[PDB]
Design a binder for this molecule. Structure first.
Ligand code: ADP
Ligand code: CO
Length: 300
């Protein structure tokens, strides 16, 4: 809520994305034109939803939030489309999860702003974990595709220091750095960790968040020096123990973990791959030497 950027000026990091989006936004506003469709792609907690709202606010139009799975029958999509006002933003999270029914109606609406038997010109903003998850057709409809990658430790530290300030708590630089290094490159994680560290500060009655307080918090939260949580470790341990380090297929791995292949590949794998703990091969996923050493498993 109060911790969510209200404009690009408040949006830390993602310089490439900001410059690209800013170019298009400022131009459209200056011409009083409807912004071209925008695709926001990247792992969760990186700011896709945040950017969608910023786009609407900058254009000074209304944003209509919806989810791919939430829309089943064309009736749901129609009601939403016909409620759009000129320049409004239609934000669809998990846009790649749109069934053939609603998707066909959407592709149609953005071809000439009209349906089966007239829609006000609008800007479609989709959010997806992976741009490839989108069908070839609908995918070619976005004039602006923004690929968000994990944030740097420095950017995360800045976001953490900002969140602490908004929560009325002081924090030392080294402490903010420590949280950033454990935030798995994600703003969402960094902010939630900061709230939990704030709770520790409260209970120990300290004047400001320091490294000691952060370490105490990480121990309680079971977050290791690499920012890995319980589930991250379970993924690596399962590959190591049950599958001898891999390669193991995504479906097989998800079945053993008792989770959907999607949550695995879309939510947890991205950072594990980025940080060099996991690798993908044609035969399946495998763990790296870094994984064994980090989890203290003898390298076979
Ligand atoms: N660049 C950023 N600067 C500051 N906070 C950010 C940034 N990106 C994301 N956040 C924060 O992290 C949380 C997660 O963002 P959100 O936009 O909901 O992620 P996504 O839709 O990609 O899953 C939000 O609370 C938000 O206010
Ligand atoms: Co497979």
């Amino acid at each position: 809520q109060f911790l969510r950027p209200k404009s690009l000026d408040e949006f830390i990091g993602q310089e490439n994305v900001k410059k690209k989006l800013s170019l298009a936004l400022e131009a459209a506003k200056m011409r009083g034109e409807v912004l071209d469709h925008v695709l926001l792609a990247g792992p969760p907690g990186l700011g896709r939803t945040t950017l969608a709202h910023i786009i609407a606010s900058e254009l000074q139009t209304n944003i209509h939030v919806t989810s791919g799975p939430v829309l089943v029958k064309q009736g749901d999509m129609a009601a939403i489309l016909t409620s759009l006002e000129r320049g409004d933003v239609l934000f669809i999270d998990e846009i790649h999860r749109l069934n053939k029914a609603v998707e066909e109606l959407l592709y149609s609406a953005i071809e000439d702003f009209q349906i089966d038997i007239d829609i006000q010109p609008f800007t479609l903003v989709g959010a997806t974990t992976r741009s490839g998850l989108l069908s070839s057709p609908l995918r070619s409809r976005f004039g602006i595709i923004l690929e968000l990658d994990f944030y740097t430790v420095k950017e995360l530290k800045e976001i953490i220091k900002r969140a602490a300030s908004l929560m009325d708590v002081e924090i030392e630089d080294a402490a903010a750095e420590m949280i950033a290094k454990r935030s798995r490159g994600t703003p969402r994680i960094a902010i939630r960790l900061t709230k939990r560290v704030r709770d520790m500060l409260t209970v120990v009655k300290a004047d400001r968040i320091n490294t000691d307080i952060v370490l105490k918090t990480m121990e309680v939260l079971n977050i290791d020096d690499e920012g890995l949580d319980e589930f991250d470790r379970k993924i690596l341990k399962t590959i190591i123990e049950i599958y001898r380090g891999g390669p193991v297929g995504l479906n097989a791995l998800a079945a053993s973990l008792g989770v959907e292949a999607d949550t695995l590949s879309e939510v947890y794998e991205p950072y594990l791959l980025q940080a060099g703990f996991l690798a993908r091969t044609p035969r399946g996923r495998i763990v790296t030497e870094k994984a064994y050493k980090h989890l203290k498993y003898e390298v076979p």
